[PDB]
């Protein structure tokens, strides 16, 4: 239950009017939690193979995601190759992938259940190993105020104004449509 | 992405990224 | 204690699509330019015989000038002759450049990459100070907390000064009355 | 045995073929020679009419090296300065598409 | 240019990465339309900018090192002979009995800019007989340290 | 106030004045360039430095349409003529009657401008793709 | 020596606060002067020969910038051809150029009216450049401040740059 | 696709389910196969005031350049 | 004759001072008329047919209701007809 503990002296500003400031405070005082049924593909992806775009099969990209529970391989649909390496990472990374995101998050390193070769080896392996199932639904809950939603409505990009703080006195029909949308979302 | 991040023109092919922890020590198929 | 590295060397080739083959005193390595920093490199009129001081972490490029190795090009050459830099191109140093809280505030509120063209637009669209709110205040508090818990950093307080508070209006007095009631 | 016992780079441009070796030379050795050239500035002024601070600066010309496909190559490209090529196509049959090579079989 | 070159030494203190591409709209992930990113980076490739130097000179100005021979006490009265012999076509030999003099004469030679070579611990494996014949054969050199 | 010489007319011809290449290399070296012009009642051929060839090269003078060149500043400037205007049914070409007066003339301009105009011209940035 | 004056109604401003307007008024008076060495070549171009292909991308040149003392055919490097051929250069004209920049300065045409110079071609000298405190503060603080040198498109410059330039001036005076 | 013939442009439903499953993973949504006859026709009734029209006309809606 | 509909409480504007606001109201209040003349060709059902590139013998058929002839062209049109690339079956 986030609060709004701010003295009324700083209501005056050179970027938000008194009405806009009061409306922002009132809409921030009332919050909404949102549950999104996002997905995952967890497990040690020991290899990341990216085959060429063959005509018969547009992507034969092998990648062997496997948790501690099971050993499994997968396939990339010519869209997720750069999702792994948006930042330059290697294989064996636990990937908290989301289907409607396109931004694959790598959690670092991971373990198999094999002893590898016969001579002395198995060196340099001490990290977190995948624990959960290969796939399971996650009803992730996110808490945001009306400020974020309104600044998203006003401009196509909203994180810049949320960080820097130059929202820009968003208009009323935005608040009306957000009222209707939140009412029907609660009803749904 | 991280703008003007560290990169040494090592591969960076948008449709080629092969890595592993070396339990087999191989690479992607080609000819 | 943050980290900076600098690539500095004589350029050997450039491959548009980006390669910049910096050749230092003992090292010759070819980075890849992102398209924005590639454009910055293009604007730097850098060609075979040039050395650039392009930082690694910020990424901005500062050409050092024409190589002193090609001093036999014109007895009255206009461009300065600077030799191939010592060490490897990717020279790494440990720096004690500290940060005030406003410094790292403006670091992300108004990024200042500098010499690259996109950094120019970044510092031109919003060159001034923007009204940082309490949300970025809490984000900054988390960032400074994790940095100071990384171990090397530390905190030191300071002293502020005000003269002739008699002229100050009741509004600032009332606001600071509730502002000193903090941590 | 000399080859066994015994065991910086410069910049230099080049120019060839179509070249205007340019020089804006006050060709005045020493004083009176320009007067003679002042004549070659003279016999093309009154005749063609349709019925020490001499002159106002000059220039010259040259070619390097011995490159002349048809007349001065500068004059060759100036012959393309008359009335273009597209209108020449319209008044012709696009003769640039009729080659003298590829001997008839 | 002379009014814009030298003073460009100030460096803004703090910068946070991934805050400019997130603002221009060109990146690998943004909420804005993706139909412009390619043409936008091409514009960045070839959109003219008049503030090129002042943009690119805000970084360090790369200072220079003095102090090789300015205060060298006993070395003041050495150029007065070597330079005069250099002009008059007389060669000379410098003999040393200290390592800390042998490692200091090199910067003096670098500053004064005469062709030189030394019979000391400052050459390579394959520059011993060749250098011996280099001294044996006449050349433009004037400084030989031993 | 200022006055600039103007050489007008229509380009009657353009020919090289060849001399043998004196410096490194042999072949062609145009001594100078003399080109005729004719405005109404005034016909005259201008002798000029050979360098004006570049202007002829640069301005695409064709033959006898527009001439703008001075004795010292030099270089031709182009802005055809109405005589050829009927040769095309429809085009996007320019045409002009025959120039009047003699080949050589002068023009006088007087303009009173405030210093504030110069100040605002200095201040206001005008241009193209420059940021 | 610089000296700045204001009146009783110029204290107020909109791009600046009265605080910052008075601050800039105080800053503008003080100045600094940095000395530097300068080199120059001077003479009269009496011969010129440029090897330049028509519609090409490779050229060389030899300009014989000379005085009445000796014959000297100087050379041009990679980009110097355009720098020394931007405007009219003839074979009598008294011409002075700089080495580190190649800038052209028209000392005057020989005739058609200055005599060919005497003395040596290459002369060295020293030049001292002056600049006020506020100017140093505004030039290096940001990127567009060069426009602010004339348009004045800045307000309340960050004090970090001011402290850095102040300590820079202090240590410059110390050394 | 979903191409309103009034403008000739494209509105994207997404990918298809028939030529789908070419790979085990796909960030792009497979999207349900469109339901009904292709030559779809409909009518829409909307109650909109005038100030929305004014503010829509005030600012540009498209564009491709800077 | 446009009528200036301005009330008393409309001149104390923010970005428009009252004096030049009154001046703007007067500038709107004035009436003026302007005339201009241009020329066009109507009915050009063209159907270009030439005998690749270069535009050799660059003349275009023009077929409107009254006159149906072939127009000769030049450097600006023989490359201006290849401009506005059309199937030449339209007005």
UniProtKB/Swiss-Prot annotation, chain B:
Record's subcellular location: Nucleus
Function: Participates in the catalytic exchange of histone H2A for the H2A variant HZT1, an euchromatin-specific factor, leading to chromatin remodeling and changes in transcription of targeted genes. Indirectly involved in vacuolar protein sorting.
Subunit (UniProt): Belongs to the SWR1 complex at least composed of ACT1, ARP4, RVB1, RVB2, ARP6, YAF9, VPS71, VPS72, SWC3, SWC4, SWC5, SWR1 and HTZ1.
Name the UniProt record assigns to this protein: Vacuolar protein sorting-associated protein 71
Organism: Saccharomyces cerevisiae (strain ATCC 204508 / S288c) (Baker's yeast)
Residues of the whole record sequence present: 2 to 32 of 280
Swiss-Prot record, chain E:
Similarity field: Belongs to the SNF2/RAD54 helicase family. SWR1 subfamily.
Gene name of the record: SWR1
Source organism superkingdom: Eukaryota
Subcellular location: Nucleus
The protein's role, per its UniProt record: Catalytic component of the SWR1 complex which mediates the ATP-dependent exchange of histone H2A for the H2A variant HZT1 leading to transcriptional regulation of selected genes by chromatin remodeling.
Note: Present with 656 molecules/cell in log phase SD medium.
The protein's name in its UniProt record: Helicase SWR1
Subunit structure: Component of the SWR1 chromatin-remodeling complex composed of at least ACT1, ARP4, RVB1, RVB2, ARP6, YAF9, VPS71, VPS72, SWC3, SWC4, SWC5, SWC7 and SWR1, and perhaps BDF1.
Organism per entry: Saccharomyces cerevisiae (strain ATCC 204508 / S288c)
Curated annotation (Swiss-Prot), chain G:
Family: Belongs to the RuvB family.
Compartments (UniProt record): Nucleus, Nucleoplasm
Cystine pairings recorded for this chain: none
Function, as annotated: DNA helicase which participates in several chromatin remodeling complexes, including the SWR1 and the INO80 complexes. The SWR1 complex mediates the ATP-dependent exchange of histone H2A for the H2A variant HZT1 leading to transcriptional regulation of selected genes by chromatin remodeling. The INO80 complex remodels chromatin by shifting nucleosomes. Its ability to induce transcription of some phosphate-responsive genes is modulated by inositol polyphosphates. The INO80 complex is involved in DNA repair by associating to 'Ser-129' phosphorylated H2A histones as a response to DNA damage.
Extra information: Present with 3030 molecules/cell in log phase SD medium.
Name under which the protein is recorded: RuvB-like protein 2
Species: Saccharomyces cerevisiae (strain ATCC 204508 / S288c)
Part of the whole protein covered: 96 to 283 of 471
From Swiss-Prot, chain H:
Domain of life: Eukaryota
Subcellular localization, as worded in the UniProt entry: Nucleus
Note: Present with 11600 molecules/cell in log phase SD medium.
Function comment: DNA helicase which participates in several chromatin remodeling complexes, including the SWR1 and the INO80 complexes. The SWR1 complex mediates the ATP-dependent exchange of histone H2A for the H2A variant HZT1 leading to transcriptional regulation of selected genes by chromatin remodeling. The INO80 complex remodels chromatin by shifting nucleosomes. Its ability to induce transcription of some phosphate-responsive genes is modulated by inositol polyphosphates. The INO80 complex is involved in DNA repair by associating to 'Ser-129' phosphorylated H2A histones as a response to DNA damage.
Family: Belongs to the RuvB family.
Record note on quaternary structure: Probably forms a homohexamer. Interacts with RVB2 and may form heterododecamers with RVB2. Component of the SWR1 chromatin remodeling complex composed of at least ACT1, ARP4, RVB1, RVB2, ARP6, YAF9, VPS71, VPS72, SWC3, SWC4, SWC5, SWC7 and SWR1, and perhaps BDF1. Component of the chromatin-remodeling INO80 complex, at least composed of ARP4, ARP5, ARP8, RVB1, RVB2, TAF14, NHP10, IES1, IES3, IES4, IES6, ACT1, IES2, IES5 and INO80. Component of the R2TP complex composed of at least RVB1, RVB2, TAH1 and PIH1. Interacts with SPT15/TBP and HSP90.
């Amino acid at each position: 239950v986030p609060f709004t503990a701010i003295a009324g002296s700083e209501i005056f500003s050179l970027e938000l009017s008194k009405t806009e400031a009061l409306t922002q405070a009132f809409r921030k005082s009332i919050g909404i939690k949102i549950k999104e049924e996002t997905e995952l593909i967890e497990g040690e992806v020991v290899e990341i193979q990216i085959d060429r775009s063959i005509t018969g099969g547009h992507k034969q990209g092998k990648l062997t995601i496997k948790t501690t529970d099971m050993e499994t391989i997968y396939e990339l649909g010519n869209k997720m190759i750069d999702g792994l390496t948006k930042e330059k990472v290697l294989a064996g990374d636990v990937i908290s992938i989301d289907k409607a995101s396109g931004k694959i998050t790598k959690l670092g390193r991971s373990f198999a259940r094999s002893r590898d070769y016969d001579a002395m080896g198995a060196d340099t392996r001490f990290v977190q190993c995948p624990e959960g199932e290969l796939q399971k639904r996650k009803t992730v809950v996110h808490t945001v105020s009306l400020h974020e939603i309104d600044v998203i409505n006003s401009r196509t990009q909203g994180f810049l104004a949320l960080f820097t703080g130059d929202t820009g006195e968003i208009r009323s029909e935005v608040r009306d449509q957000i009222n209707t949308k939140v009412a029907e979302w609660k009803e749904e | 992405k991280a703008l003007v991040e560290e990169i040494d023109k090592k591969t960076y092919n948008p449709d080629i990224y092969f890595t592993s922890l070396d339990p087999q020590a191989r690479r992607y198929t080609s000819k | 204690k943050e980290t900076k590295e600098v690539y500095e060397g004589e350029v050997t080739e450039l491959t548009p699509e980006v390669i910049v083959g910096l050749k230092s005193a003992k090292g010759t390595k070819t980075l890849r330019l992102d398209p924005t920093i590639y454009e910055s490199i293009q604007r730097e009129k850098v060609s075979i015989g040039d050395v650039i001081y392009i930082e690694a972490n910020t990424g901005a490029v500062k050409r050092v000038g024409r190589s002193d190795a090609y001093a036999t090009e014109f007895d009255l050459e206009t461009e300065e002759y600077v030799p191939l830099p010592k060490g490897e191109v990717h020279k790494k140093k440990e720096i004690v450049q500290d940060v005030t809280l406003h410094d790292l505030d403006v670091a992300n509120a108004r990024p200042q990459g500098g010499q690259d063209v996109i950094s120019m637009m970044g510092q031109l669209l919003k060159p001034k100070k923007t009204e940082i709110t309490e949300k970025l205040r809490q984000e900054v508090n988390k960032v400074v907390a994790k940095y100071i818990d990384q171990g090397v950093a530390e905190l030191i307080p300071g002293v502020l000064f005000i003269d002739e508070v008699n002229m100050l209006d009741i509004e600032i007095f009332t606001y600071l009355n509730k502002a000193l009631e903090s941590n | 045995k000399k080859e066994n016992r015994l065991a910086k780079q410069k910049f230099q441009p080049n120019e060839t073929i179509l070249q205007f070796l340019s020089t804006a030379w006050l060709m005045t050795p020493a004083m009176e020679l320009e007067d003679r050239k002042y004549w070659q500035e003279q016999l093309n002024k009154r005749d063609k009419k349709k019925k020490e601070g001499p002159e106002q600066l000059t220039s010259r010309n040259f070619v390097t090296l011995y490159d002349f496909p048809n007349a001065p190559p500068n004059l060759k490209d100036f012959n393309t300065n008359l009335f273009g090529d597209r209108w020449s196509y319209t008044n012709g049959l696009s003769a640039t598409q009729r080659p003298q090579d590829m001997k008839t079989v | 240019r002379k009014i814009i070159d030298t003073f460009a030494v100030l460096t803004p203190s703090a910068v946070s990465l991934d805050m400019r591409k997130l603002a221009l709209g060109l990146n690998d992930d943004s909420s804005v339309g993706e139909n412009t990113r390619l043409k936008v980076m091409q514009n960045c490739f070839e959109v003219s900018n008049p503030l090129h130097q002042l943009q690119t000179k805000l970084t360090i100005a790369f200072p220079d090192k003095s102090l090789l021979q300015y205060d060298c006490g006993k070395l003041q009265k050495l150029a007065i002979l070597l330079q005069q012999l250099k002009d008059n076509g007389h060669r000379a030999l410098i003999f040393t009995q200290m390592t800390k003099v042998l490692d200091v004469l090199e910067q003096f030679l670098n500053y004064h800019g005469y062709l030189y070579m030394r019979l000391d611990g400052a050459t390579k494996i394959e520059d011993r007989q060749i250098l011996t014949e280099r001294f044996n054969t006449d050349s433009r050199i004037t400084v030989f340290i031993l | 106030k200022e006055t600039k010489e103007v050489y007008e007319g229509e380009v009657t011809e353009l020919t090289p004045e060849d001399a043998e290449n004196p410096l490194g290399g042999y072949g062609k070296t145009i001594s100078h360039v003399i080109v005729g012009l004719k405005s109404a009642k005034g016909t005259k051929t201008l002798r000029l430095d050979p360098t004006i060839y570049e202007s002829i090269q640069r301005e695409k003078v064709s033959i006898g349409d527009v001439i703008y060149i001075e004795a010292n500043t030099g270089a031709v400037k182009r802005v055809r003529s109405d005589a050829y205007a009927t040769e095309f049914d429809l085009e996007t070409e320019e045409y002009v009657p025959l120039p009047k007066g003699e080949v050589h003339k002068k023009k006088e301009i007087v303009q009173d401008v405030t210093l504030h105009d110069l100040d605002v011209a200095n201040a206001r940035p005008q241009g193209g793709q420059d940021v």
